[PDB]
Design a protein around this nucleic acid. Structure first.
Lengths: 50, 86, 196, 122, 52
RNA sequence: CGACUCUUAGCGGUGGAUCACUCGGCUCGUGCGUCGAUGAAGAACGCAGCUAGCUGCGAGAAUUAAUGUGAAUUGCAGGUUGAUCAUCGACACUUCGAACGCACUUGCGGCCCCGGGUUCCUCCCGGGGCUACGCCUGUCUGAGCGUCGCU
RNA sequence: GAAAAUCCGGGGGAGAGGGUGUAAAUCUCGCGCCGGGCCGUACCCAUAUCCGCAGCAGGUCUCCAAGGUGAACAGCCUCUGG
RNA sequence: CCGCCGCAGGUGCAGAUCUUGGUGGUAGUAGCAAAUAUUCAAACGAGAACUUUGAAGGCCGAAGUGGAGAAGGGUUCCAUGUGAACAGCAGUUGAACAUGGGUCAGUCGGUCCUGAGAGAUGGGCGAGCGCCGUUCCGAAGGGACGGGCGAUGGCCUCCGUUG
RNA sequence: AAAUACCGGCACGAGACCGAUAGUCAACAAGUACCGUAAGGGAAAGUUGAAAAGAACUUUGAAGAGAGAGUUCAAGAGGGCG
RNA sequence: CGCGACCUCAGAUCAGACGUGGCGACCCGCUGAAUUUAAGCAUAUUAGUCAGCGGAGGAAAAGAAACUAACCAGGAUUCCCUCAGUAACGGCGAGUGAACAGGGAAGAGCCCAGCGCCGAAUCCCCGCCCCGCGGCGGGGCGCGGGAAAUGUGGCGUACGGAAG
């Protein structure tokens, strides 16, 4: 909710910084396996735990 | 009303994040972790789950100390000396 | 995806196999000590008769004469160039020139399981002493070295067929008269053994 | 500029603090340039300044300990940082001399009856 | 703290502070609104720190 | 007549079988047989010029030093007195964690020291060194109509 | 038909206060001075931001509450708002 | 990669409401029917039954489709774009997508108190992990108001400061 | 002490084994994504080519998607592509 | 009433140290089922097995006979071959089931207490200095403290031992 604990707000803060796509230059590398970010999570799709 | 309508009343949690093992199984009323038993000194682990063991053993995390013990073992745990400089 | 698939059973995707292969499978077969000698006496006997050695496949056509016995200064070799120029003179080199021409690739899963290259069995050089004969012959493809006291049936009869072209040394060839005896003298290098 | 450790290790104590904060300022002039979004050459520099602060603070932390175990060496007790961190079970073992302690009686049995170099005749 | 920042901005920029208002962003980092006392100028000291 | 439908072949889609590979397994053998209050295993959270995951790492944060190695790193920018890799013995190693000042809200204390406020002289702010229980040997201050002792 | 933190008044009179002042001890009076760290704060709150696999006719705790008709927070109609 | 001679086996599939993966007929079929209802003009645009703006006609009708919060959500907030996929027609449109930006406290909450209760220590039990019990079988107070010799800051003046 | 045990741990060698529906659950950002309040459950997913030479430039369309060209032995190998 | 020894207890953020937790394949101490089998089932069997609990180590444990035997005797423990699916147990049903001797791998023996003698002959810690030690050790130094006659050290342990 609006009423958060400091520990939970740092938990959410990590999950937002992990919910960005791959940089466009990453798959121009030599050992190129990654196409897109498979671990991208959406607020309707998956509910983050908690 | 036991099914779909009763799911609507699910707004107050029991388990929060445990703080030994990060595992969301720290029961708030009981104040004990269902995954590790936090207030207990001893890690909750059982032999009826050999799969739940390998999820949380020495081969799981970093071994941020236990890897530099393995690397320092092969030179007999030498301490203090430096390699002869130029 | 797994939730409600089908886990256990030989027919299920994932799952185990029917009768999972065990480490306590009876891997090894012990033979009678007597029958082991009666294979070698049957292997040495069929590698003089040159019909069976050609029927084995060994190129023996220019071997000048003999179940071939060489002088004892072939034990004294320390280089392969001494050992190659030996097999030129005894005219058994066409049996290694055959082995060179048999160095092809193996068929199938043997390649990815460290059995990549298959070649042919060449001449077998049985020796009394070692002053470097093994060092001198080992780099040549085809040649396998046997001590006379320790003759292997796997190296005297490769494939389970008989007549591997065996090259002998002089002091080696006379020790067979002691290891196995004759039909009236007993074996001196065996406790209780006569020829069958 | 190329900053090395060899020249820092033979310098005076107070100068390395001034050499440190002169880089702290220099690093904090580039963290501004990263956010403003100007001069691409002032971003490749920022890793040179980060790793060189790690040199200056190391040569500080190095020589501030080789001074401690120079003064505390001739003392029966020394701080836990200056004590040998061999494994916990290895620290609990007996001393080199405590293993050399045989009994007065085992210094009599091994005195009178030494294990003899002998042979036989076949 | 708001006290540590009140010296941090004072020590590194030779300036004084009226008050500090810190909020932790959704990113997880703290943002100090360092209100400067009016004996100094905020837009002029922005040239010193090198932001425009 | 056609259209519709069936059969067959060609080509084309659909689908991922087969076959060929294989920096992965499994099995067997060998040597070694080392964690932790000097803070383990684990967990959290951080850190790259552009980096989400994976590894690497710990405010010195894809690493510092040192020894070896002797010219790259590389997806793209940028700038031999040793680049870069391996090694690693020096240093460093934030937060929870047996987890250790008392509590899990990262909430509230104490004592000694230092520095700003000053020119010891308190509140205040920041920093630092200590503060967990069980026990062991010695120490210290005690307690008892315990046992006696001398007046 | 709650405790406890917390706060205040009282009853006592151990004490303290100065020696006729440049008065003292003392004050719950009127000004003055300095300080207040730490964490949460956006937005949805439900026929589309929650829980029911979903923009699911389900479920889910409250605050404000206009005019007319009327016994009326009934129903219907209208204003602000949507 | 294969023939021959030997050796070995996880060695031959149509079935098991077999297992996994894929694709058919049904079939362009059922369906996109709860709570009254939309029309006109213009704009942007390649493109309009749906978007935006004005003008109509309507509904909710203050126990509301209104304006706010708790729990839950965790960036869904707001702007700027594109409009592949998603939003069961569409789309210039969105809570989608991608770049960004955004939550400021002595006073509002949290912190603090205790409630039903939870739960250490002593103790008791216990093979043991532990468990019971919470004032009960405990030497359970580390605070002040008082008196001299010492002592430190200050003209050791005499208090703060110490034992 | 020694002979003895060792489906964990460190570093190794080997296989008449398995060859991506097999072999460990995991050959890949695998105890990952995801599900359950929790204990726990737990996947799918290898291959362009010798070298990106990864299809310049022209032209239809709003763009997707084409037609020419061009690289290559081959695109009858066109970014999940033997 | 007082000061003193002592015994039995407290308290300390007293000076030093030490335990906790993890891993857990193997190893030691407990605890301990039921599927199953007996064509049912209850004793048995599964099985002193899975699960639960504590504790280690590089291996653990065992171990130098209160042994085996009955011979013409062997001689710690451990493991391997065998005895042996044997003696024996058992609704004598199902099923369970050792040991000695022998042949090998290795092979290693020992220490107290008690009984006694030696002026406690013993031991830990602090201060002082000295070479010096990333296993705080050897030497000197103090009518320095403590442990200890409710027994420390030497000799000595069943194979005998002490003293002259």
């Amino acid at each position: 909710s609006s009423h958060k604990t400091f520990r939970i707000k740092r938990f959410l803060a990590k999950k937002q910084k992990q919910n960005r796509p791959i940089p466009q230059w990453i798959w121009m590398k030599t050992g190129n396996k990654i196409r897109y970010n498979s671990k991208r999570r959406h607020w309707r799709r998956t509910k983050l735990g908690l | 009303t036991k099914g779909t309508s009763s799911f609507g009343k699910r707004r107050n949690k029991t388990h929060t994040l445990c703080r030994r093992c990060g595992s969301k199984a720290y029961h708030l009323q009981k104040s004990t972790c269902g995954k590790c038993g936090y207030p207990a000194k001893r890690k909750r682990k059982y032999n009826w789950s050999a799969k739940a063991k390998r999820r949380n053993t020495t081969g799981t995390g970093r071994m941020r100390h236990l890897k530099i013990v393995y690397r320092r073992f092969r030179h007999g745990f030498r301490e203090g000396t430096t390699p002869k400089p130029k | 995806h797994r939730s409600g698939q089908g886990a256990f059973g030989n027919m299920c995707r994932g799952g185990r196999m029917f009768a999972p292969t065990k480490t306590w499978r009876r891997w090894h077969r012990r033979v009678n000590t007597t029958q082991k000698r009666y294979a070698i006496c049957s292997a040495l006997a069929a590698s003089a008769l040159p019909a069976l050695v050609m029927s084995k496949g060994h190129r023996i056509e220019e071997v000048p004469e003999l179940p071939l016995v060489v002088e004892d200064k072939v034990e004294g070799y320390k280089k392969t160039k001494e050992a190659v120029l030996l097999l030129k003179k005894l005219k058994a080199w066409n049996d290694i020139k055959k082995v060179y021409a048999s160095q092809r690739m193996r068929a199938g899963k043997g390649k990815m399981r460290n059995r990549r290259r298959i070649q042919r069995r060449g001449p077998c050089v049985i020796y009394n002493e070692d002053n470097g004969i093994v060092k001198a012959f080992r780099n040549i493809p085809g040649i396998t070295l046997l001590n006379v006291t320790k003759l292997n049936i796997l190296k005297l009869a490769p494939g389970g067929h008989v007549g591997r072209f065996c090259i002998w040394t002089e002091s080696a060839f006379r020790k067979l008269d002691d290891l196995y005896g004759t039909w009236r003298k007993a074996a001196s290098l065996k406790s209780n053994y006569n020829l069958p | 500029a190329k900053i090395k450790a060899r020249d820092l290790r033979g310098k005076k104590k107070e100068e390395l603090l001034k050499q440190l904060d002169d880089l702290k300022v220099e690093l904090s002039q580039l963290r501004v340039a990263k956010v403003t979004g100007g001069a691409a050459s002032k971003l490749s520099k920022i890793r040179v300044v980060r790793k060189s602060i790690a040199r200056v603070l190391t040569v500080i932390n190095q020589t501030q300990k080789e001074n401690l175990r120079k003064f505390y060496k001739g003392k029966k007790y020394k701080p836990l940082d200056l004590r040998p961190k061999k494994t916990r079970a290895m620290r609990r073992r007996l001393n080199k001399h405590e293993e050399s302690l045989k009994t007065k009686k085992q210094q009599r049995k091994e005195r009178l009856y030494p294990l003899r170099k002998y042979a036989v005749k076949a | 703290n708001k006290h540590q920042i009140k010296q941090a901005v004072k020590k590194l920029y030779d300036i004084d502070v009226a008050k500090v208002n810190t909020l932790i962003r959704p990113d997880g980092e703290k943002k100090a609104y360092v209100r400067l006392a009016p004996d100094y100028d905020a837009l002029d000291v922005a040239n010193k720190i090198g932001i425009i």
